[PDB]
Symmetry: C5
Subunit: 208 residues, 5 copies
């Protein structure tokens, strides 16, 4: 038991403290994103901002984070501070305030080199809630992707194209009629290369 | 005089603890840990019916114990405990599951360690969480619930326990806008899409209502 | 040119005091007394839909440490210095009923004297639990908030006051609120959770809309 | 395999640039620098007529080129550019001259450095600035303006250029409370009382009105 | 060439900051005069439900340290450079009646000149204690706020102004409020804590609604 601690000490150390500069064209990366929507907190129709609370599942895999669990006392994974590893700069493209982080910044690293990171967020973004008081509700959309890596450096994937609604707050002012998450491709004025985003479409209405 | 000596003893202990074998990497399946959580509810500051957020101020008592923090008192001039900045040691990642704003810390981040390896930490906090206050202006009032638990450690790494099911109300602000009808704290199990492993929370349930 | 010396004398004084030895805060074996006093500058806002009131004040904090003494003759005849608060231990004095983190309004800089005595006067803005009922009347409203160490009991940190009158002499003469009285009282209690004494200084303020 | 080689190649280059001859100390009259700026306006979020403040969301393409940042790709695995944290390199101190709050940064602080030593950095921001929204509720709309430029570097040390004088509006939020009649960005010169030497800014003028 | 100018700048910066480490601030034996001049950009809001007013302004700060002198000849004819304000000591100039932490609007970069003189001009937003009554009248309202070192007596930091007129030449022409006048005047203050006097510059602004 004092042994196992020492094994993990040794592996963090081997991993971090002696031997990654982000993805490149030669060494591209695939980040998988899934959203879990917890609450539409507020719809401000005097500014067309909507605040959402959700979490965002991120998963990716680095060869430099691999190890053999036999060399390390059968450790298959460990938890770690997100600052000790590279994380992807997944950004919402139409936010109107800096994202508020609601969960501790810790990730999970597995022996095959995959990393899982699940930050919870409050986000204000651009959305006209006209018709939220109608049957068909209002429809808002926000794109998420790397701000600086093109699609030849960071690819994006979803496991499914439904947002996760299974922990949506049942007593929220808004109900969700539908929530999808879909990969897309864009070009930006700066650059030849296309950029990848995952677009959250959310349809919602005042609970009544 | 012996003042200088007890000062040296404490610095020596601290450095024996921290700068030898060091910083403990958190709990694992092989080395699990039980955190005892307890809440002291001070005030429901605000209940916003247009967003269904409620704002609470409370102290969250966290208690755990690590082998790596044991020492013998007679070896350090009979020091039985000490205060230390929370940045100095490992602390658990206890998170409200339905917050809507980051938590605002109202007390200094200092814990107490005791020779037997236990640690105490009582952050005071202000939390906004998801809560529909319908009914708060009635006799029955309203009821809300928010879970607390590690965000990244399953039940096999961090288990949670309470000392009692009853929220401490003996410091509840007597002139709050809202009075407290009941407030309990009960351990639960949850599952999350990412993982087969069970996650543990303490669910805080508060029934409250406008003061007359 | 005496001015390069004075300056080296001071830097040397810093080294010798900071990285030599080293202070871990107070203990049962080596307790400390902190003198506090409040200077109330303004009641800024009284919100009666949430029962919070915002104060602006600064707090005089004084204490004395042996680890902090020096002979001035060995250091240029330097008798005192200004130093960043991050460089020295400071007491963890907290309000016990805040509703928002305190916002800090003055430099975190303290003054250290050769006898080990330290002086520090943080100016702060505080929201705390307070029902302003009756500010709009002649008797006014009463509020209270205690301050004390959050983690040290009276066996490690003792508080004293010089007066039980809050200093109102720089109170803002055009506040939305007049002060009718403002007192600060040392209190000792036991919380039978635990057998050792606890000390706080209870700020009691009486106030009404300015007329 | 070569994936590990290309990784090592980058590690090497970054090291080679970033510790020697390290932190290049900014532009000087002997060694001035040109920054090209272009704005992409996304949204007018709020126009407050009780305080005369307007809140914009935009991003700002910034480009410049340093000698100290050149390299031969052939000497580095044919690496022709790389992403890097904005803190590891000098970046220009372009500020809004009439903001009323600190700018909130919306995008990560990361830049792209090419082998000829050109750098590109595109921070997205939320700005409150001095603007009388009078007229916004009419056909004619309101006109506002905000100068951007170095705070401390005169036009002998930093020049500004634009590629076009038209703000890019192809990402303007289509259902904003405000529509854009026109948005231009124009290089200007200015003096301040501190200093004899003129300074450069790029003036963002926007004409806009409530959508109907 | 430009390789040499950079070489030289880098050498010089290394010499001041390293080579003779970090300057302990001013003392009774090494005192310091800071010149201050305000430029008022905008009165943004005047809140009469709390008597707070928000100003946007910049504050010109000059002082001179002997330990910042160099001979431009040893150093490639570099007469000045810009530098991050964290690489150097700066004065802790603080508003005495602020009700919020000051928000900084400009980058924190100073200019250092070879005679050892430093210019630093931070832009800020400030909320301070001010009763805006009369603002809608012809006479307008009048508010004042004091600025100066929070911890250094006049024997360590003295202040002076170049003129008693606040610079209005950049006042925002479409502000909710016009300025009828604006002065800055050096004063000498005594606090309870201290025998020694503290110096401050008093900002008196008289203002009203635009019409
Ligand atoms: O021209 N662009 O707008 N580019 C752009 N907009 C949003 C993200 N993005 C790509 C980008 C590319 C390079 C850098 Cl330094 N930043 C951003
Ligand atoms: O899919 N999940 O929501 N997982 C999850 N939600 C709250 C806590 N939790 C488990 C978890 C597991 C691993 C990481 Cl890296 N983050 C979070
Ligand atoms: O006299 N000034 O107002 N100068 C000035 N105002 C805005 C930008 N600027 C130039 C300047 C020059 C030097 C320093 Cl340290 N700061 C600012
Ligand atoms: O007794 N005082 O209020 N002193 C005081 N108030 C505002 C500034 N000032 C001087 C001072 C002197 C020393 C320390 Cl540590 N802080 C402040």
């Amino acid at each position: 038991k004092l042994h196992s601690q020492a094994n993990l000490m040794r592996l963090k150390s081997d991993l971090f403290n002696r031997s990654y500069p982000g993805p490149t064209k030669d060494d591209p990366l695939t980040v998988t994103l899934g959203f879990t929507l917890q609450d539409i907190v507020k719809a401000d129709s005097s500014t067309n901002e909507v605040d959402l609370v959700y979490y965002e599942q991120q998963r990716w895999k680095l060869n430099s984070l691999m190890w053999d669990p036999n060399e390390y006392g059968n450790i298959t994974d460990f938890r770690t501070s997100a600052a000790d590893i590279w994380t992807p700069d997944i950004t919402a493209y139409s936010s109107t305030r800096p994202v508020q982080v609601l969960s501790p910044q810790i990730a999970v690293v597995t022996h095959d080199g995959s990393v899982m990171f699940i930050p919870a967020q409050r986000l204000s973004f651009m959305c006209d809630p006209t018709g939220v008081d109608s049957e068909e509700g209002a429809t808002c959309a926000v794109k998420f992707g790397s701000w600086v890596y093109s699609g030849f450096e960071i690819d994006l994937k979803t496991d499914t194209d439904q947002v996760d609604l299974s922990s949506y707050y049942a007593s929220s002012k808004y109900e969700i009629l539908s929530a999808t998450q879909t990969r897309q491709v864009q070009h930006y004025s700066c650059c030849p290369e296309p950029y990848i985003d995952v677009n959250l479409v959310v349809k919602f209405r005042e609970r009544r």
